[PDB]
Amino acid sequence: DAEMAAFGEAAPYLRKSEKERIEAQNKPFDAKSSVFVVHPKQSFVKGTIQSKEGGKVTVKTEGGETLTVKEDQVFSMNPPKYDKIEDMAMMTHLHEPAVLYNLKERYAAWMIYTYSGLFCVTVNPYKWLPVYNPKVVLAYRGKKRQEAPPHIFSISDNAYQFMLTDRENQSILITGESGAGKTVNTKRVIQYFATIAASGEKKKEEQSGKMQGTLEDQIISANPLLEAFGNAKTVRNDNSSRFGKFIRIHFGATGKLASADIETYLLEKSRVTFQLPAERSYHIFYQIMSNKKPELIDMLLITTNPYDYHYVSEGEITVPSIDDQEELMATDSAIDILGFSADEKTAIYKLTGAVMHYGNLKFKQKQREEQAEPDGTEVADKAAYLMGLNSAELLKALCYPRVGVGNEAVTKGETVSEVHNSVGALAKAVYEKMFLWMVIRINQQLDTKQPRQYFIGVLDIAGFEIFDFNSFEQLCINFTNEKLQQFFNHHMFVLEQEEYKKEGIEWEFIDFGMDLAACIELIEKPMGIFSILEEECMFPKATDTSFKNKLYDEHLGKSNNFQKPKPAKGKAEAHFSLVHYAGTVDYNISGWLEKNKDPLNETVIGLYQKSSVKTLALLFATYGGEAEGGGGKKGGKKKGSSFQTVSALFRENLNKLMANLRSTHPHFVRCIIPNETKTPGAMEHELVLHQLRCNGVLEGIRICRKGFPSRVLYADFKQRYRVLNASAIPEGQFMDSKKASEKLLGGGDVDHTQYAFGHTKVFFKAGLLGLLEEMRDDKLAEIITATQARCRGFLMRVEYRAMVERRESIFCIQYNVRSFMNVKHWPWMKLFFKIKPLLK
């Protein structure tokens, strides 16, 4: 309360009033009866234990329901002291339910940031909050996470701190499902950096501030370009990230901004050509056809009605929450700031329209032949011109692909179905490349000469998602995540072990990563999936089926993580399941071989390679330089620098990444999505539960509980408990952020066993906290019983003072009455009586 001011307005969403707290922690609780329990419809609901069937349990509900469930379908419930705990990992009850429940409660109260160990859980508000508030930004500035409530800037500032304090590089790993809202955070983190450590001095003035011509802006402006090209309306989000990313903010020596570095991973090439019914393609398209810059429409040779471009109107065209017109400029302007040449800025556009046109390219069967022949030179003409090509040459190459099988170049004929498909392949190919280029070009501007001493990496990618249908793309992502996870499990193992070393506890344990090495080797190692995948890609006459068998003959029965599918449930077909940390994933191998080969009509590429549109020409260069290497039929593309695998890079990139991640001090952020239905203050259970498993959150709790469940971070320990031996615990906490907590525990009639200290935090038992209380319980009987007595004593002591006072007033009353009883019958007295009145 006193503290909170900085936020003030945000406060309510960060922390609760000091009595709201008090009124919550200090309330009646019946441990032995209060519990969490399994539940067929709702995941886990709370209840009170009624009876006990010797190994069965009957419980009442909170809604009113009675169920008799197993002994282990029943889970304890944390004392009220742990209501809306900033760090669930401090709880003395490391369960599945208690975690769900904590998140949930502090959300219904509008607190989106709750920590779960090292993580920084974040829940989608689905509404607006004063959190990103320009006051907060400062507030979180220079504060350990124990000096302030759960928030992202905490993570983000600490990184910075740590950055300069330890002279190590840092990282932030943001991860969640499609609708969790990571971009948002990522972006928000980024602003944070830019703000708290900028100072271009000259660039700071209110004169076209943030326009092209400064980075802090470039840095920023970056997003809105990428977003136009790599973002789209998903059925979950309205601006979903259809690719992954890694930015390196290169801080200087002083501590002020110096450089940036983007890298893109796994772009959703398919949107470019397809789209689900409730979705839509990349924004750009819709941006452009919006008509805010009419020249563009005529320049590209298109219309404003998307239904003229099959590729981009298979799903939806308009989204109410998006103003395509505004963005177009945003985008536009960003390009400029980004330093692109008008020409390039022209290529981009012109190139983005060609692609639309391609999808309009039509063909027909030559008569009496099964060959494809152009169905007109209306569109080709446009596509051709827009790309700096020749209509004819183009349609030929497309129709009569001139190949090179043997030591020559053999002209091959294609079918209608073959063309339509090849076209689509280029459309996608071109878009991609371009996108890649843009990134590079961005990076190029984001390159300064100033020295760099450290960087802070911000990684945004997807998390392990399980679908009834898991294809190639899923493997690639899952694999990424299963790696990331191990990356954590280790950091934690390293971390943990420091405490027990700092404190002096005697705990031995094996790396927690190790548990996952099994799965990883199976994928990335030499005779593993990828290899078998990338080898077969070399066999001119291999089949998905072929590949499949090779997969089995070699891993089946011999490998544990390897399994043959469970074809039924919500799944669509059979091929192979894997046993990832999050669970079993059923993978379908169909298209892999192809997808992995990235087959492109080289004749056409040829044309690109010699376009009048330099940029287009450029994008293709690297294909043109490896052809030397795969001159004759069969063989290896790599000889000339051409990719041999769809997967060959992914790995290379994923390695270059996980390596960059190592020379880093990992900082974790887990983004969460409350309800599919888009409702603030709400949460489906099992939906959040899921995420938690695949997040790593539930695994961090596990590893925690091995043991000493709840683990308190030192500052987070000071603040909350200083008050207990106030003088001696405050001194300890202030005098040494760590040494303090140490010193504090000096007092209390508590089990000095149940805990254990270490380099970053204390370890605590539960049933420990349970133990504590008990001791405490006895200690009040003492305190109370004694305080009762005096009272009791004293109580009667006042009775004597009254009894005594009364002493005579009674007598007076006593005797006085008696008189009358005697008198009232006496002549003389009756006389006096009748007579008493006549007097005066």
In three-state form (DSSP H/G/I as H, E/B as E, the rest C), the secondary structure along 416-444 is HHHHHHHHHHHHHHHHHHHHHHHHHHHHH
- Numbers of helices and strands, H then E, in the chain: 30, 23
Distance CA 743, CA 423 (A): 72
Question: Is 341 within 8 Å of 221 (Cβ atoms)?
Answer: no
Residues in the chain, overall count: 840
Tokens linked to 598? 């990235």
Distance CA 284, CA 286 (A): 5
Question: Is 591 within 8 Å of 543 (Cβ atoms)?
Answer: no
**DSSP β-bridge partners for residue 665:** 170
**Please, which contacts does 42-47 make with residues 24 or more away whose CB atoms are closer than 8 Å?**
42/685, 43/100, 43/685, 43/686, 43/689, 44/75, 44/96, 44/97, 44/100, 44/101, 44/685, 46/77, 46/101
Per the annotation, binding residues are 176-183
Per the annotation, binding residues for ATP are 176-183
Distance CA 747, CA 9 (A): 37
Please name which of 442, 254, 437, 228 lies closest in space to residue 332, comparing C-alpha atoms.
Answer: 228
Distance CA 300, CA 298 (A): 5
Tokens linked to 408? 């020559």
Please name which of 14, 302, 26, 13 lies closest in space to residue 145, comparing C-alpha atoms.
Answer: 14
Q: β-strand 74-76 against 576-579: which pairing, if any?
A: unpaired
Angle between the 685-695 and 97-105 helix axes, to the nearest 10 degrees?
110
- Which residue intervals of 582-662 are DSSP H helices? 592-595, 602-609, 614-626, 648-662
Residue owning tokens 């505004």: 326
Q: How many CB atoms lie within 10 A of CB 202?
A: 8
Residue owning tokens 């006051």: 135
CB within 8 A of 634, min separation 6: which ones? 540
> Of 117, 179, 359, 513, which is the active-site residue?
179
| Catalytic residue check, 241 | yes
> Of 122, 158, 169, 183, which is the active-site residue?
183
Query: Which helix (H) or strand (E) segment is 672 a member of?
Result: strand 665-672
Question: Is 116 within 8 Å of 700 (Cβ atoms)?
Answer: yes
Tokens linked to 838? 């006549």
Ramachandran quadrant class, 272 (left: phi over 0; alpha: psi -120 to 50; beta: rest): alpha
| Catalytic residue check, 240 | yes
| Catalytic residue check, 179 | yes
Q: How far is CA 654 from CA 245, 443, 482, 522, 647, in A?
A: 11, 19, 12, 16, 10
Question: Is 686 within 8 Å of 742 (Cβ atoms)?
Answer: no
Q: How far is CA 88 from CA 84, 93, 188, 698, in A?
A: 8, 9, 24, 11
> Of 102, 241, 603, 664, which is the active-site residue?
241
Please name which of 484, 472, 379, 385 lies closest in space to residue 699, comparing C-alpha atoms.
Answer: 484
Tokens linked to 671? 């983004």
Q: Cα 585–428–484 angle (5° rounding)?
A: 35
Q: How many CB atoms lie within 10 A of CB 729?
A: 23
> Of 61, 178, 390, 737, which is the active-site residue?
178
Query: Which helix (H) or strand (E) segment is 629 a member of?
Result: none
Q: β-strand 244-251 against 264-265: which pairing, if any?
A: antiparallel
For 366, counting Cβ atoms within 10 Å of its Cβ (0-12 exposed, 13-18 middle, 19+ buried), the class is middle
| Catalytic residue check, 463 | yes
Cα-flanking dihedrals φ and ψ of residue 576, to 5°?
A: -175, 140
| Catalytic residue check, 178 | yes
**DSSP β-bridge partners for residue 57:** 52, 69
Q: Cα 102–103–105 angle (5° rounding)?
A: 65
Tokens linked to 21? 């707290």
| Catalytic residue check, 76 | no
> Of 237, 478, 596, 642, which is the active-site residue?
237
Cα-flanking dihedrals φ and ψ of residue 87, to 5°?
A: -130, 95
Tokens linked to 280? 């839509």
> Of 76, 240, 259, 695, which is the active-site residue?
240
Instruction: Give the rounded distance of the alpha carbon of 691 from its chain centre.
Output: 9
CA atoms within 13 A on the CB side of 707: 22
Question: Is 478 within 8 Å of 585 (Cβ atoms)?
Answer: yes
Alpha-carbon Rg for the chain in angstroms = 36
Instruction: Give the rounded distance of the alpha carbon of 203 from its chain centre.
Output: 33
Distance CA 580, CA 620 (A): 38
**DSSP β-bridge partners for residue 113:** 122
> Of 339, 463, 528, 624, which is the active-site residue?
463
DSSP assignment string, 520-544: HHHHHSTTSHHHHHHHHTT-TT--H
Please name which of 328, 336, 32 lies closest in space to residue 208, comparing C-alpha atoms.
Answer: 336
**Please, which contacts does 725-731 make with residues 24 or more away whose CB atoms are closer than 8 Å?**
none
Distance CA 305, CA 283 (A): 15
| Catalytic residue check, 725 | no
Tokens linked to 491? 């950091």
Q: β-strand 120-123 against 665-672: which pairing, if any?
A: parallel
Tokens linked to 799? 């009775």
Q: Is 801 in a helix, a strand, or coil? A: helix
Tokens linked to 360? 């309009």
Tokens linked to 47? 């209840």
